[PDB]
Design a protein around this ligand. Structure first.
Ligand SMILES: [Mg+2]
Ligand SMILES: [Mg+2]
Ligand SMILES: [Mg+2]
Ligand SMILES: [Mg+2]
Ligand SMILES: [Mg+2]
Ligand SMILES: [Mg+2]
Ligand SMILES: [Mg+2]
Ligand SMILES: [Mg+2]
Ligand SMILES: [Mg+2]
Ligand SMILES: [Mg+2]
Ligand SMILES: [Mg+2]
Ligand SMILES: [Mg+2]
Ligand SMILES: [Mg+2]
Ligand SMILES: [Mg+2]
Ligand SMILES: [Mg+2]
Ligand SMILES: [Mg+2]
Ligand SMILES: [Mg+2]
Ligand SMILES: [Mg+2]
Lengths: 117, 51, 151
RNA sequence: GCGGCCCCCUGGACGAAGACUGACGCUCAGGUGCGAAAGCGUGGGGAGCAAACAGGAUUAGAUACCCUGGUAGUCCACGCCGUAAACGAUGUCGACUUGGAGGUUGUGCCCUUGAGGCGUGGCUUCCGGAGCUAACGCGUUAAGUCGACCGCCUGGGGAGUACGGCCGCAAGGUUAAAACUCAAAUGAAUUGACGGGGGCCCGCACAAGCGGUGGAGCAUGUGGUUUAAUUCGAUGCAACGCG
RNA sequence: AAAAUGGUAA
RNA sequence: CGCGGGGUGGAGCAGCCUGGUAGCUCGUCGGGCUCAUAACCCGAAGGUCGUCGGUUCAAAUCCGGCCCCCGCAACCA
RNA sequence: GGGUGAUUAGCUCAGGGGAGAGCACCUCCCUCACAAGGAGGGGGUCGGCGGUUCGAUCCCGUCAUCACCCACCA
RNA sequence: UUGAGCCUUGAUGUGUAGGAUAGGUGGGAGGCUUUGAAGUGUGGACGCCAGUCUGCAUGGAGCCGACCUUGAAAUACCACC
C-alpha cells in the first residue's frame, strides 16, 4: 500500500534483545519485529540466530509496500547486528548503505555502578 | 561507521568499526569506573607492555 | 578415548545374505551371547516382512531403516557454566546404529506373541513410517530443531 | 590536587649572556595558613547516579551480593569541619661517589647541505656496579659516604581508650594515662600442604554403551535387641560370604 | 545459579 | 457482676450455616546424599475434636450444663 | 414485574458448512537437584426443551441461572 | 476533515453429490446485441486459491439452457428481497 519502494531498516541490537524496524525515509514506521516476539524467549533471544528470524519476519509484513531498496542503520552492540543485515540481503532487498548510529557520549552522564556478581 | 557501497558487493566490509570505537567504548562506558581504577588499570597496562 | 584414538573391530557378514549391516543387526538383538537364537529370530522376521510387502529381504529391511535413521541430535555442551542442548550432525555409521537400536527397543515393548512377530510388525510399520521407532526419530529431530539457536 | 574552546586578573619554574648587592644563609618548639572524600549551616539548583527506604528474587535464613524504583547527597554561592593506605608507608637543606637504555623541555657550534654531527642545562621513567640492608630490596631522584636542625619510638592487649584542658553548631578532632592481664606479639625469607588460582597431561573419571544393586523370597555377615551364654577380633574408601 | 560447619589435650 | 469469641496430631493454624470418611506448615520416625553434621531428596506415622447430658439411624459440626482462656462493659450520685 | 445482556473442557475467554485460544492434570526428555525450557495425551449436547432448510455452538420462543438499569415499595 | 448517518444505483453469495465462488423465493421456456458480445492485460479486495465484482484498452458480430448432477438447477430475462 502506497508503494513507497524504498526506506530504512533500523536495527536496535542490545545484549538482551534485538528490534528491527523498517521505515520510509522520513522516519515513518511501516513494520517491525523482535527476537522476543518470534518465540524462544529468555536466554535464546540474545543470539545471532534469534536476530535473523526477527529480520525475516520484518521483511514480511512490509511486502505490501513493495520495498525494493533500503539503507540499514545499526545501533548498539549485541549478538545480532551482523546477522540481521545478512537476513535482509537474503530476503531480497537491495542494500544501498550500511551505517552504525550507536550513541557515543563525549563522557556526559554518569553510568550505573559496576555489578558485583 | 558510514560505508557508501558500490554496486559490486557481496561482502559487508564492516571493518571501519574495529578501526573505530565500535564496541570498545560501549563496553567501557556501561559501568562507572572510579577514577582510581582507571589510573591503576592504565599503569599496569603498560607495566606489562615491556619486553 | 582420552589419549589413544583406536581402530575398528571387524565382523563377519550374515550367513544367509552376506551383508555386514544385517550381521550387526543380529548382534544388537542378541542377548546373553546367544547368536543362534538371535539369527533365528531375525531370519523369521525378515521372511515374514518380505512376503507381507513382496519386495525382498534386504530391500524391505533397508527401506525400514531409511525411515528411522536420524540426521541431527542434541548434546549437552556446558561451555560457559550454563547447560545448553546444541544440535550436532550424526556420523553416517552412528545413524544406522541408532536406527537399529531404536527398532529393537520398539519391538521389545510391542505386545505381540513371538519376538519374530513383534519385530516383523515393528519394522513393517517403520516401512510405512508410523511405528514407535519412527516417533522416536521425529522427537529427536524436533528437539534438535527447537535448539537450532545454538551452533 | 589540576583535562572541551575563548577572553580578563594572577603565582611559580627553566634557559642564554651580561650587570648588580655582598653572607643578606639552613633548620624551626610555640604560632599562622592551606588541606581529597564524606559531613554540617543558610539560600539556590536537580538531568544522570545513588546511602536510607520499598518491592522482586536467591537462601536453611539473606536486615546482603543480583533485579525494579528511589530520598539525602553528588552541582552552585558563602561559612564551618581539619580527617584519609593525606603513601614513595622514605622530614628539610648542602657536599661527594662506576654505568646503560628511554621520555619531556631549553640552549651553543658545525655545510640542515631530510627525520643529521659535536656539546651544555632542567625535570622525569626503567635496569643495574661498589656500598648498604635481617632479608626483600635501595642504588647519583640512595635505603651509599658525611654535616646542620627538627619530629617521632621503646613488648602485646587494655588504648589512641578514660578523665581533664583546648577547639567545633553538631558529628567529633587534638593532647593523653592507669589498674589489670600474657609470654609472647612482630618483619623478611625457606620447604611443604592447600586454593570455588593458571598451564600441561593421565585414569571405566566423565561422555558412548551393556548388564546389575536399591523392591520380592531365600543364603550369608554385621548392627541392635534378647539371653545363663548368645566367646573374641575386624569398623569410611582400605570392616560387614572378613580371621 | 547455589555450596555452612569440623569439641579438649597430645 | 453482665455481654460476646474460642478449646482440633508434639507447636501454630484450617475444617463452622454445608450433622453421613481431620488437612497443612514445622516437628517425629526409616532410608538416601556427605569423611561426618547441617541443608537437600525419598517414604511413613501420628486425632478422648476441653468434659458431661440430650435429638437424630448417625454429633468435631445441632442444642443445654461444667472447666479453662481471650476481649468488651461496670455509669449518675 | 419491564428492558438490557450473558451460560462452551478443571479454570479464563473466542468463533449458516471449522468449538479456537491461554492457563490446569499425566507422561517425555531436560536439569546435580532442580529450576527454567521444549514435546505429546487427553478434558466439553457450546445448559435443557421445542421450532425452518440438509444439518445448521450461529436462527426463533419457554424454562434454570447470573449481571445491571428500572418499576415495585402500600 | 471525519464518521453516524440519511435517503438511490452497481456488486455481494466455496463442505456436500457438481461446469461449480448452488444467497432464499417466485413470474419464469427465452434474451442483450452498433444504449459493443467473443479471443488478451490491467488494479482494490478476497479467499476452504474458484477466480472472481471491478476501470479501460487491439478487438468486433455471439452464446448461454435446460442437459451429468445435487436436498436444492439456472443470475435464460424479470421481480419480493
Ligand atoms: Mg543494569
Ligand atoms: Mg609546629
Ligand atoms: Mg564535599
Ligand atoms: Mg549542604
Ligand atoms: Mg539545600
Ligand atoms: Mg540498586
Ligand atoms: Mg593521621
Ligand atoms: Mg601514590
Ligand atoms: Mg605517616
Ligand atoms: Mg635498581
Ligand atoms: Mg579520643
Ligand atoms: Mg575530650
Ligand atoms: Mg556413564
Ligand atoms: Mg533385595
Ligand atoms: Mg561379633
Ligand atoms: Mg571390637
Ligand atoms: Mg583393635
Ligand atoms: Mg569377598
Amino acid at each position: 500500500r502506497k508503494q513507497v519502494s524504498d526506506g530504512v531498516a533500523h536495527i536496535h541490537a542490545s545484549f538482551n534483545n534485538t528490534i528491527v524496524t523498517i521505515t520510509d525515509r522520513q522516519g515513518n514506521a511501516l513494520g517491525w519485529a523482535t527476537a522476543g516476539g518470534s518465540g524462544f524467549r529468555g536466554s535464546r533471544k540474545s543470539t545471532p540466530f534469534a536476530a535473523q528470524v526477527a529480520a525475516e519476519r520484518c521483511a514480511d509484513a512490509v511486502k505490501e509496500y513493495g520495498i525494493k531498496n533500503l539503507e540499514v542503520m545499526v545501533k548498539g552492540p549485541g549478538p545480532g547486528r551482523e546477522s540481521t543485515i545478512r537476513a535482509l540481503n537474503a530476503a531480497g532487498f537491495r542494500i544501498t548503505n550500511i551505517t552504525d548510529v550507536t550513541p557515543i557520549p563525549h563522557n556526559g552522564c554518569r553510568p550505573p555502578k559496576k555489578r558485583r556478581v | 561507521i558510514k560505508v557508501r557501497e558500490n554496486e559490486p558487493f557481496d561482502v559487508a566490509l564492516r571493518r571501519f568499526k574495529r578501526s573505530c570505537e565500535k564496541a570498545g567504548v560501549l563496553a567501557e562506558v556501561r559501568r562507572r569506573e572510579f577514577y582510581e581504577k582507571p589510573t591503576t588499570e592504565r599503569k599496569r597496562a603498560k607495566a606489562s607492555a615491556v619486553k | 578415548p582420552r589419549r589413544r584414538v583406536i581402530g575398528q573391530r571387524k565382523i563377519l557378514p550374515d550367513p544367509k545374505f552376506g551383508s555386514e549391516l544385517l550381521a550387526k543387526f543380529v548382534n544388537i538383538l542378541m542377548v546373553d551371547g546367544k547368536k543362534s537364537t538371535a539369527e533365528s529370530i531375525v531370519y523369521s522376521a525378515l521372511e515374514t516382512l518380505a512376503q507381507r510387502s513382496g519386495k525382498s529381504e534386504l530391500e524391505a529391511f533397508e527401506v525400514a531403516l531409511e525411515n528411522v535413521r536420524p540426521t541431527v541430535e542434541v548434546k549437552s555442551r556446558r561451555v560457559g557454566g550454563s547447560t545448553y542442548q546444541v544440535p550436532v550432525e550424526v556420523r553416517p555409521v552412528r545413524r544406522n546404529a541408532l536406527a537399529m537400536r531404536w527398532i529393537v527397543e520398539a519391538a521389545r515393548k510391542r505386545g505381540d506373541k513371538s519376538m519374530a512377530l513383534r519385530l516383523a510388525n515393528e519394522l513393517s510399520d517403520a516401512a510405512e513410517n508410523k511405528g514407535t521407532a519412527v516417533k522416536k526419530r521425529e522427537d529427536v529431530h524436533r528437539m534438535a530443531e527447537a535448539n537450532k539457536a545454538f551452533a
